[PDB]
Scaffold this active site. Structure first.
Site, PDB file in Angstrom:
ATOM      1  N   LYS B  46     -22.162 -67.981  59.980  1.00  0.00           N
ATOM      2  CA  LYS B  46     -21.623 -68.996  60.915  1.00  0.00           C
ATOM      3  C   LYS B  46     -21.044 -70.264  60.182  1.00  0.00           C
ATOM      4  O   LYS B  46     -20.386 -71.077  60.788  1.00  0.00           O
ATOM      5  CB  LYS B  46     -22.706 -69.416  61.908  1.00  0.00           C
ATOM      6  CG  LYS B  46     -23.487 -68.236  62.498  1.00  0.00           C
ATOM      7  CD  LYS B  46     -24.603 -68.684  63.436  1.00  0.00           C
ATOM      8  CE  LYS B  46     -25.619 -67.552  63.683  1.00  0.00           C
ATOM      9  NZ  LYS B  46     -26.813 -68.001  64.462  1.00  0.00           N
ATOM     10  N   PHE B  86     -26.327 -66.902  47.425  1.00  0.00           N
ATOM     11  CA  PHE B  86     -27.195 -66.625  46.274  1.00  0.00           C
ATOM     12  C   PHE B  86     -28.638 -66.375  46.743  1.00  0.00           C
ATOM     13  O   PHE B  86     -29.278 -65.383  46.330  1.00  0.00           O
ATOM     14  CB  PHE B  86     -27.091 -67.842  45.235  1.00  0.00           C
ATOM     15  CG  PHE B  86     -28.345 -68.126  44.467  1.00  0.00           C
ATOM     16  CD1 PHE B  86     -28.868 -67.184  43.590  1.00  0.00           C
ATOM     17  CD2 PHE B  86     -28.875 -69.408  44.443  1.00  0.00           C
ATOM     18  CE1 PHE B  86     -29.950 -67.510  42.764  1.00  0.00           C
ATOM     19  CE2 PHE B  86     -29.965 -69.717  43.650  1.00  0.00           C
ATOM     20  CZ  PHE B  86     -30.503 -68.772  42.814  1.00  0.00           C
ATOM     21  N   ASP B  91     -32.992 -62.854  48.307  1.00  0.00           N
ATOM     22  CA  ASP B  91     -34.082 -62.665  49.282  1.00  0.00           C
ATOM     23  C   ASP B  91     -34.038 -61.250  49.878  1.00  0.00           C
ATOM     24  O   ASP B  91     -35.070 -60.630  50.075  1.00  0.00           O
ATOM     25  CB  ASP B  91     -34.036 -63.735  50.410  1.00  0.00           C
ATOM     26  CG  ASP B  91     -34.438 -65.134  49.907  1.00  0.00           C
ATOM     27  OD1 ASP B  91     -34.890 -65.238  48.711  1.00  0.00           O
ATOM     28  OD2 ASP B  91     -34.262 -66.139  50.663  1.00  0.00           O
ATOM     29  N   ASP B  95     -37.278 -58.689  49.838  1.00  0.00           N
ATOM     30  CA  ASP B  95     -38.017 -58.203  51.042  1.00  0.00           C
ATOM     31  C   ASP B  95     -37.544 -56.825  51.529  1.00  0.00           C
ATOM     32  O   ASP B  95     -37.945 -56.360  52.594  1.00  0.00           O
ATOM     33  CB  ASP B  95     -38.056 -59.259  52.167  1.00  0.00           C
ATOM     34  CG  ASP B  95     -36.706 -59.649  52.648  1.00  0.00           C
ATOM     35  OD1 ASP B  95     -35.755 -58.824  52.522  1.00  0.00           O
ATOM     36  OD2 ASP B  95     -36.574 -60.785  53.217  1.00  0.00           O
ATOM     37  N   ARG B 100     -27.759 -57.380  56.852  1.00  0.00           N
ATOM     38  CA  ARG B 100     -27.566 -58.805  56.849  1.00  0.00           C
ATOM     39  C   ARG B 100     -26.209 -59.114  57.541  1.00  0.00           C
ATOM     40  O   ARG B 100     -25.196 -58.541  57.198  1.00  0.00           O
ATOM     41  CB  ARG B 100     -27.554 -59.314  55.377  1.00  0.00           C
ATOM     42  CG  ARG B 100     -26.946 -60.718  55.178  1.00  0.00           C
ATOM     43  CD  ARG B 100     -27.864 -61.809  55.673  1.00  0.00           C
ATOM     44  NE  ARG B 100     -29.135 -61.826  54.947  1.00  0.00           N
ATOM     45  CZ  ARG B 100     -30.091 -62.722  55.149  1.00  0.00           C
ATOM     46  NH1 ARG B 100     -29.897 -63.752  56.001  1.00  0.00           N
ATOM     47  NH2 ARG B 100     -31.227 -62.631  54.482  1.00  0.00           N
ATOM     48  N   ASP B 162     -43.767 -68.803  50.088  1.00  0.00           N
ATOM     49  CA  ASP B 162     -43.665 -67.841  51.181  1.00  0.00           C
ATOM     50  C   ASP B 162     -44.206 -66.468  50.726  1.00  0.00           C
ATOM     51  O   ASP B 162     -44.972 -65.806  51.459  1.00  0.00           O
ATOM     52  CB  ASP B 162     -42.231 -67.708  51.640  1.00  0.00           C
ATOM     53  CG  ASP B 162     -42.112 -67.073  53.003  1.00  0.00           C
ATOM     54  OD1 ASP B 162     -43.080 -67.143  53.799  1.00  0.00           O
ATOM     55  OD2 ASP B 162     -41.040 -66.555  53.308  1.00  0.00           O
ATOM     56  N   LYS B 187     -38.389 -74.262  51.654  1.00  0.00           N
ATOM     57  CA  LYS B 187     -37.563 -73.010  51.656  1.00  0.00           C
ATOM     58  C   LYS B 187     -36.280 -73.114  52.510  1.00  0.00           C
ATOM     59  O   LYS B 187     -35.249 -72.478  52.190  1.00  0.00           O
ATOM     60  CB  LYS B 187     -38.379 -71.836  52.114  1.00  0.00           C
ATOM     61  CG  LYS B 187     -37.690 -70.485  51.928  1.00  0.00           C
ATOM     62  CD  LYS B 187     -38.581 -69.352  52.382  1.00  0.00           C
ATOM     63  CE  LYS B 187     -37.909 -68.490  53.400  1.00  0.00           C
ATOM     64  NZ  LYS B 187     -37.131 -67.434  52.718  1.00  0.00           N
ATOM     65  N   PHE B 226     -35.782 -76.771  63.690  1.00  0.00           N
ATOM     66  CA  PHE B 226     -34.836 -75.690  63.634  1.00  0.00           C
ATOM     67  C   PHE B 226     -35.517 -74.372  63.390  1.00  0.00           C
ATOM     68  O   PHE B 226     -35.162 -73.376  63.971  1.00  0.00           O
ATOM     69  CB  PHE B 226     -33.866 -75.938  62.528  1.00  0.00           C
ATOM     70  CG  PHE B 226     -32.942 -74.841  62.304  1.00  0.00           C
ATOM     71  CD1 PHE B 226     -31.942 -74.574  63.210  1.00  0.00           C
ATOM     72  CD2 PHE B 226     -33.051 -74.052  61.180  1.00  0.00           C
ATOM     73  CE1 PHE B 226     -31.033 -73.535  62.989  1.00  0.00           C
ATOM     74  CE2 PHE B 226     -32.165 -72.998  60.959  1.00  0.00           C
ATOM     75  CZ  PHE B 226     -31.151 -72.749  61.862  1.00  0.00           C
ATOM     76  N   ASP B 230     -36.036 -71.211  65.779  1.00  0.00           N
ATOM     77  CA  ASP B 230     -35.765 -69.907  65.160  1.00  0.00           C
ATOM     78  C   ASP B 230     -36.914 -68.898  65.375  1.00  0.00           C
ATOM     79  O   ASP B 230     -36.682 -67.771  65.764  1.00  0.00           O
ATOM     80  CB  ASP B 230     -35.518 -70.087  63.667  1.00  0.00           C
ATOM     81  CG  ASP B 230     -34.383 -69.308  63.189  1.00  0.00           C
ATOM     82  OD1 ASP B 230     -34.312 -68.110  63.506  1.00  0.00           O
ATOM     83  OD2 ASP B 230     -33.527 -69.880  62.483  1.00  0.00           O
ATOM     84  N   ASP B 231     -38.146 -69.318  65.085  1.00  0.00           N
ATOM     85  CA  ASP B 231     -39.304 -68.416  65.181  1.00  0.00           C
ATOM     86  C   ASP B 231     -39.574 -68.035  66.639  1.00  0.00           C
ATOM     87  O   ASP B 231     -39.813 -66.852  66.967  1.00  0.00           O
ATOM     88  CB  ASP B 231     -40.524 -69.065  64.573  1.00  0.00           C
ATOM     89  CG  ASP B 231     -40.441 -69.160  63.026  1.00  0.00           C
ATOM     90  OD1 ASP B 231     -39.487 -68.569  62.429  1.00  0.00           O
ATOM     91  OD2 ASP B 231     -41.351 -69.778  62.410  1.00  0.00           O
TER      92      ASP B 231
END
Ligand SMILES: O=C(Nc1cccc(C2=NCCN2)c1)c1ccc(-c2ccc(C(=O)Nc3cccc(C4=NCCN4)c3)cc2)cc1
Ligand SMILES: O=C(Nc1cccc(C2=NCCN2)c1)c1ccc(-c2ccc(C(=O)Nc3cccc(C4=NCCN4)c3)cc2)cc1
Lengths: 330, 330
Positions: B46, B86, B91, B95, B100, B162, B187, B226, B230-231
């Site tokens: 975005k 990056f 990431d 994980d 993506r 994390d 993070k 934010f 998000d969560d």
């Protein structure tokens, strides 16, 4: 003896990098892990690169070295070692290596795995934290920041080029001389040989574009011989003298040796992509007298490097370059 | 409309980063690959962060923006986007993600795999190449270099934290509030919210320590809301409105939601580490009225952010912060 004073300064390096705990305890666990990454990965090599910074530096000034100046020379030495550790931790993941420096690769540790990627990035980041901590008030601060960033970029470009060239399946049409030189230059020579002297140079107030360009001409050629010797020794060295035994041929490496073999193989010898990648290329290398070709190239290369120093060292002391050469050349 | 002028500037960004071919053809193949890494990985999000740099910047000066100045604002916008790319490429490896931005993760591409690690490092490096190319003669050059390096370090520290906290097996004793806030801060919040405004700030000649510290107070709190939103949305959002459906609970995420659940579960509800990691935590979250707790926290958080702007914005225009807030808060 010196190398030991350099190795001594690490526990302070680590102390200083793990101080934020004091001011920010919430991140304590992350800092402890960073300390592990440091101690696993920065210790255990020969430290020639970081040490090159101290020797150069001390040869490049005589009364302008109080305790603080020498401290900064040590710190920037260790920054080079951190740069190296960042590359090696990451390169070891990329090529699925098992061991490093007679030890299990950081990432092969149970509980680490691909978290090593962030670990590697933290090593990188610690470079610029040390520079700020020790060098921010120095006139050469920005020059060193840019030098370490440029060295990283070159190295990464070299690694790209290496990955395109020796994919993790035989192909020999890529293994050319011009490509080999180009990989050595960007992946090894810039950060191993130019970076350490150039940083010492900047720390001595020698910031001239012309001088750096001259030093670079000498040092990239030294780097090139270094790696080529490295390649020769990988196979033909004595593990009783070298401290490891080599796996280049199995790994589909763009070795100097295979590049030399290819430009000197009748089509019968050529193929033979039937034995490159697991046992004996080794027998064919001896059939083409590559050990004598090496011996000859080493003699020409030494001649060439001495003329380069003659022509390009001034106004720097030849000793700075001669010291490195003596080490490279048995 | 603006965002499009920002997206337009990319082909120049890429052009400029792939110029060295001209002066150094030996590295052509490596540069082509870098161009692929750019175009795969920097495009398709975005662009709120990079765009935040341009809007901030243009709101923070009125007649001091000739074509070159706006060009630099765009370039530094894109540097933020490169920083993000990056992190995300790296990431995604760490994980073991599959997709993506509705696309296969760069590293899941056949022929890429763990080479993505070096690819990620090149994205990082391109930040400091753009800064040098466009900003080296600017008074704020060093400030931006240090800002991007500090942002990276914070982010990497956050990621460490994390990884220690949500290992890739259930454990809930680690999922505390103080730990959650701390992960979000380092993070996500620093690089997503402070970095873009602070860079605009520096580019407008606003280099004061006090002012940056004030802006930071506001922006880290915005970052925190934010991520918490998000969560909440990960689970309780509408994929028809959001553009993805969420997998936090399966992934053993330190979600705001699970942190809230834990400080509000009788031991029966507590365990229940029997359903955290693959289906319905979801049912228990609703039993504890977490959607109303969110609604309430959002109202308090908005109040809090408006007072923060009131207290800490000056001498910057409130609009710079109000613009972000309006976007964050539906
Ligand atoms: O302190 C020594 N040299 C030194 C260090 C720092 C600066 C200077 C210097 N001279 C004046 C300017 N700087 C010289 C020194 C001590 C032992 C050695 C020694 C270490 C390794 C070897 C050896 O293994 N060579 C070798 C062959 C192939 C590869 C490598 C290697 N080293 C780093 C990665 N690969 C190393 C040979 C000699 C080298 C240098
Ligand atoms: O251009 C817009 N905002 C904008 C951009 C740049 C600067 C400013 C600004 N205002 C004055 C100061 N700067 C505002 C804009 C357009 C559409 C949106 C929009 C995009 C995404 C969403 C949405 O998905 N929100 C959302 C929720 C949870 C996560 C994310 C997200 N975005 C990045 C990674 N995660 C995003 C909501 C609104 C946001 C901003």
């Amino acid at each position: 003896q010196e190398k030991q004073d350099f190795v001594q300064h690490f526990s302070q390096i680590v102390r200083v990098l793990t101080e934020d705990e004091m001011g920010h305890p919430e991140i304590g666990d992350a800092i402890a892990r960073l300390k592990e990454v440091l101690e696993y990965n920065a210790i255990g090599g020969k430290y020639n690169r970081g040490l090159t910074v101290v020797v150069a530096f001390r040869e490049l000034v005589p009364r302008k070295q109080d305790a603080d100046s020498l401290q900064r020379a040590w710190t920037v030495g260790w920054c080079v070692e951190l740069l190296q550790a960042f590359f090696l931790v990451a390169d070891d993941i990329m090529d699925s290596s098992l061991t490093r420096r007679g030890q299990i690769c950081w990432y092969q540790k149970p509980g680490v795995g691909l978290d090593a990627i962030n670990d590697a990035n933290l090593l990188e980041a610690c470079i610029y934290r040390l520079l700020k901590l020790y060098c921010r008030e120095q006139p050469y601060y920005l020059n060193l920041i840019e030098l370490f960033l440029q060295s990283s970029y070159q190295t990464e470009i070299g690694q790209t080029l290496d990955l395109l060239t020796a994919p993790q399946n035989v192909d020999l049409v890529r293994f050319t001389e011009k490509r080999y030189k180009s990989i050595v230059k960007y992946k090894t020579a810039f950060y191993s040989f130019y970076l350490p002297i150039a940083a010492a140079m900047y720390m001595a107030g020698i910031d001239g574009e012309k001088e750096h360009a001259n030093a670079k001409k000498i040092l990239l050629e030294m780097g090139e011989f270094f790696q080529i010797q490295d390649d020769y020794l990988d196979l033909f060295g004595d593990p009783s003298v070298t401290g490891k035994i080599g796996t280049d041929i199995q790994d589909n490496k763009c070795s100097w040796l295979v590049v030399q073999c290819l430009q000197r193989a009748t089509p019968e010898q050529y193929q033979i992509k039937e034995n490159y990648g697991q046992v004996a290329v080794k027998a064919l290398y001896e059939e083409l007298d590559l050990p004598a070709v090496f011996l000859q190239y080493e003699e020409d290369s030494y001649s060439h490097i001495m003329a380069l120093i003659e022509q390009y060292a001034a106004p720097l002391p030849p000793a700075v370059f001669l010291g490195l050469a003596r080490k490279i050349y048995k």
